[PDB]
Symmetry: C4
Subunit: 390 residues, 4 copies
């Protein structure tokens, strides 16, 4: 039957370029004839032959009559959906996988694992699907909105690896990692180190031995919690990224947090899920990251790179690698993912571009994608082209 | 070729949890751009790779101009349709299998058998289709609305079993079982025992030797007729369920029916198709059941379980195992089905949540799905989210 | 690679029953959200695993703005389209095969052959497609609307067989048969016998040696031209059906044409394509036919059968086998086709039910299907359920 | 694996005939229910089993609210999209391949290569994708709207060739050819000869050793630049076509350009992409070409052919071979492509028929297809049937 997937060396290239924009609300005009789904938290995950574009829908379309409440994060109607990457997630193109207000999914080389969380806030539930079958669940351990990545889980040799977290969005939220094989949790991994608050980890393989994640600390800092998870020992350690180029939003000016790598600094409250993807070369490792152009608002999105070093000890500024979204455009969640070419993996960053008109109208998002290709500098930015009044 | 399906041991787990809501009319607003079909009697049946969500459509969409008559049960337009489970059943997503106002379907491991009943009330006709080909029929034996399950039929080693019945809705309706192989009736089974009214049986495998069904008595009792069909001998016997937890609607208060297990009791007229599925373990069998929260109306739905014992003689109350649909929400027909995982079968109960605004507007239904998933207790309920005025 | 298809013995059964109604305009309401295509001349043809539902579209949808001219038969916009049988031929479900205002198609066991005719009336052109590729053409020989069957062609061992005709609709139109293999015309067959006018032949296999067709004579008679085509010698002979049950519309009363089988009789001018399908048993042959209930109008449709005999010499009345469409409903073109079960062929008759409101509105049709299944008598009729004002 | 594609001898035939019209806006009326995408620069490319119809969309549908700017050629929203040939390119039928305002694509026998150009005018970028993976880029060399073919690239034995150009629309635009294998540029070919302005080349195989292209000169001449690229040596030479039948638009009267074959002539400013395809026979090669009926406007389209000779030195008029589009109808870009039959290749010419109502309304296009089919002469023309006011 198919081989299990492993991370491979990345395809050759030294810059990212604009790849693709999925802007479903370019067709949502009241005079139009389409039914784009209202969604937020999009992410992409690829198998050997295909990529799926996932999101959490509010189970409502534009145009339609169910806009009220689409700016809320959790309720009894949100579902995890997907379409083949390159299709436009409408009512008929999408597949509804499970009721969920937090999600993840990944392919292990043989089948898709789908993860969704739902249940009441004080006692939510991780639910796992392998293909068509519901196979396992995991309980709330801190009884305060158990939740997961909002981006792809990561499989190697049939073992997938997922961050989950539970606890207060303004206080302690210690994450755990689940090791899942054929839809069933075979190991729970309790991290060591700086564990006070880790959520929405964007994870990827640095090698066949290590999974790394750049996460969100919604409570204490604008520096991102950076997980190193050893896949051979199933152990994990977390420490704050030490770079002066703070990747969260909100954040203080770069380099303004004085003290050791561990100092939390200022404007720590609040956060945003950030993009992070690995470029694995024979001798070296590129870590590519994204952050908003604004320090305080979810506007714009810029690309940054650092080759090698130790993200927990390196204070060096990340190298600015191009404007993906200008400050005039929305820049909300961003995530890494990798496309499987024939012999090598292609690193990409996807950007959630939310159309926000506040609670009195529909709330949904476009997804912009940039991927490593060729050499040079990043050339063009992305606009959604959507007028929310139509 | 592919080999034939057999029931396997159920996947590990001890509670049901909210899996999926298919609510097509969340997209049926007059100002929206979708075409959900108007349906009732949904059910799901799965083969080794995928599941199909079936329903009997009135051959009309919302928004549309044919809402009159969609609250009738039988006419010349109703058709059995399906979509792959997970898709919204719209005009374009759906497949129209055959003209029918009562239906069933099941997969034997190699192909789908589809079953539909249409024809005049005094002379209806069972029609069987195997894949694309129409292969056989069975005639009315009591000339009073020949009808079938409204849920999956069941196949073992190539032989599929189906309940059919015929007779008065408020009098005698003696069912029979047809044994069907590659779309042709190879045997008729005439049940013995308590036989005066059995309809809409929800059937599943208790083992490789026994099919059991929890049925509806629309005339005489609020107890469900419980069929035990021996697959090795092709003989069936029926007796009423003796549990004090009466599963029909309408029903008297639990435990108020005095006298031996077979006593009919009061409030027997009327009925509802009920959910029933098996959890097969090595040394134990769980029988999961659903019934409305309201004793007299199709409102709410809760789950019950009992392990082992004999349904025909056990008077004990079933164990309440969670509220799937609150009193506030519609709880109409429910049904069991099993999803095939790699090595084990996952039992589920689906619930038809009818949008009933009376005879003056459209009448259709959402389908909610709960499956055996991990451990603990059932955590959340399902709402349709539909405002019928839009 | 796949085996070539051959006709097999028909599946067991002795009556036809209502199978399926495809009524695309049940969704064409101005307040609805669907795009059913405007079409006429539907027909169905099946391969080993699937059937396609073909029609000639006017390249316009309901609701829409291009109704004017949809009651005309030939123009530069008509195209041959198809969908999988059981889907609803809308703008997005359909596939456009080629520009055509007359068509046919069949599967040879390996690939689909598509035939369409277009060009000016005085010099039209047969065009042949095998799969995706355009492979051959045939010229007009009488320069008066070269045209073909409007129903399936018939393949045996890779050789397909198609009727074409050319000439005046009110005078002589001598047909020819094309023998096509892998999309290319390998033989032209000139019939003998009564050849003055033959068009719209509905053809099928009576055995591996003979193809038979019941055709339309638009000029001279209400008796149908009946072709016997020997597949081993590639020769064909045509004579009028001798039965007193005249199958054309318009027609005189049954049995009123006195004289030998060859007498044309009265009300010969005008015609309609009629259904005809074979039931091949080990020792005997059933010939099933359809005709309108009205003698003069395209209203209603009745089924008739005759086992064995010689249609060219037998004066015997055909046995009435049931009302498929009542006189209150439209009954326009009808055609035979066969569905491939596992070991045997299932004969069916499809009926074009046109929604005709004259030239000031849209003109299109539903397709009703009846197939041989089980024993007894035909039980229920078909209505389109369409109100042309919505 | 699958083996690589090579050009084969063309299928037998001697005239082209009307094959297929894809006219998406026949379904775009404000009162209809469809969503045809607004596109320009359609082209078709085929692999062994299927063909894809590509176009550059403005990421907008009709009816819709984003008609402004759909008459511009380049912006941040244009995307290369495709549907399987035969499908209508709507919002849901289409696949969005990549952000691009100039494109190309071709199949090498194992996978699709997709090519798109986007980026600022002064610094655009060729992006290549192989299946799902983004694999390579090529930068602007003259910093003035780097651009490519708007028609299929061409693969032989795994190596695909593509024309690119860069430079002034009204001055020097020296093209180059890229040789691409599994999505990566393995060679750049710098043509020799008459090189001052070559763009929008329509290229195909004259044999296994030569690719020829008929191109556009937007600055200096109404003669088409004609490329001969030697696949064995990866060298290319360009000279102007010497035929008195000038194929560009605008153009002077046929045969009015005095002096040697290379003379530029008058009315050289402006241009149009032109149809060109090869018919390869054992001892003879036919070169089929299309040009507008009007000498100065994009109206009408007729077909021409010449067998053998050398385009660079032959002054002879080409043979008029039929009117594909009347003067009455729009005739904009045209392109060649070949469909793969079982044993031979079918040459076709497709025509973009733009709906131009000026800058105040939507601007999009229908695609008409003519292919080599049987013998005789071309019989009918194509109309779009679209009323732009609906
Ligand atoms: C499970 C859940 O509610 N996730 C929400 C998340 C959460 O509130 C925060 O991460 C603190 O824990 O925040 C956001 C947000 O746009 O910022 C959207 C997510 O839907
Ligand atoms: C074949 C048929 O009519 N089935 C109908 C069934 C029947 O009336 C009853 O089971 C008595 O026989 O009842 C109901 C119902 O909602 O209660 C709906 C079904 O469509
Ligand atoms: C090719 C063509 O025009 N076919 C037309 C056919 C023809 O006019 C007649 O068969 C005389 O030849 O008649 C009819 C009709 O409903 O009666 C519809 C067909 O579209
Ligand atoms: C890349 C680009 O802009 N292409 C445009 C092209 C270009 O302007 C000309 O070929 C001079 O270079 O012209 C046209 C045109 O309809 O004539 C449409 C193309 O979209
Ligand atoms: C990871 O391991 C697999 C075999 O297990 C190997 O083929 C692959 O190239 C390795 N990837 C990296 C990044 O070293
Ligand atoms: C049923 O029978 C098959 C073999 O016929 C066996 O593989 C399967 O495990 C059995 N299932 C149960 C529940 O006994
Ligand atoms: C026709 O011939 C094939 C073999 O060529 C045979 O299998 C089939 O059964 C025959 N059909 C009939 C109707 O005799
Ligand atoms: C091209 O080359 C292949 C073998 O490489 C051959 O099969 C094919 O027929 C050749 N085509 C032409 C036009 O010569
Ligand atoms: Ca659709
Ligand atoms: Ca923070
Ligand atoms: Ca009852
Ligand atoms: Ca006649
Ligand atoms: Ca020019």
């Amino acid at each position: 039957e198919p081989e299990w997937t492993y991370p491979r060396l990345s395809c050759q290239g030294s810059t990212f370029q604009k790849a693709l924009l999925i802007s479903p609300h370019r067709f949502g005009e009241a005079r139009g004839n389409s039914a784009p789904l209202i969604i937020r938290e999009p992410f992409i995950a690829c198998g050997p032959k295909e990529c799926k574009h996932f999101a959490l829908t509010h189970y409502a379309a534009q145009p339609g009559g169910y806009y009220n409440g689409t700016r809320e994060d959790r309720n009894k109607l949100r579902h995890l959906i997907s379409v083949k990457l390159g299709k436009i997630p409408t009512v008929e193109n999408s597949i509804f996988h499970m009721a969920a207000w937090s999600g993840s999914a990944c392919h292990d080389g043989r089948e898709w694992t789908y993860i969704g969380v739902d249940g009441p806030d004080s006692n939510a539930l991780i639910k796992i699907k392998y293909g068509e079958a519901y196979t396992d669940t995991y309980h709330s351990y801190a009884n305060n909105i158990l939740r997961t990545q909002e981006s792809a889980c990561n499989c190697i040799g049939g073992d997938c690896y997922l961050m989950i977290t539970d606890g207060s969005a303004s206080g302690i939220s210690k994450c755990r990692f689940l090791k899942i094989r054929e839809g069933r949790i075979i190991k729970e991994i309790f991290p060591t180190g700086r564990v006070e608050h880790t959520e929405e980890c964007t994870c990827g393989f640095a090698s066949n031995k290590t999974i790394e994640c750049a996460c969100r600390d919604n409570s204490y800092t604008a520096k991102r919690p950076f997980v190193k998870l050893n896949v051979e020992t199933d152990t994990a350690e977390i420490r704050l990224m030490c770079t002066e180029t703070y990747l969260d939003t909100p954040r203080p000016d770069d380099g303004s947090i004085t003290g050791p790598c561990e100092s939390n600094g200022d404007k720590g409250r609040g956060g945003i899920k950030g993009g992070f993807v690995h470029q694995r070369m024979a001798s070296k490792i590129g870590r590519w990251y994204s952050r908003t152009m604004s320090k305080t608002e979810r506007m714009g999105m810029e690309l940054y790179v650092r080759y090698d070093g130790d993200p927990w000890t390196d204070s060096d500024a990340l190298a600015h690698s191009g404007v993906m979204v200008s400050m005039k455009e929305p820049g909300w969640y961003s995530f890494g993912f990798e496309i499987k070419d024939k012999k090598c993996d292609v690193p990409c960053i996807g950007i959630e571009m939310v159309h926000d008109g506040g609670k009195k109208t529909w709330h949904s998002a476009a997804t912009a994608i940039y991927c490593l290709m060729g050499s040079g500098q990043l050339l063009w930015d992305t606009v959604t082209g959507v007028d929310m009044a139509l």
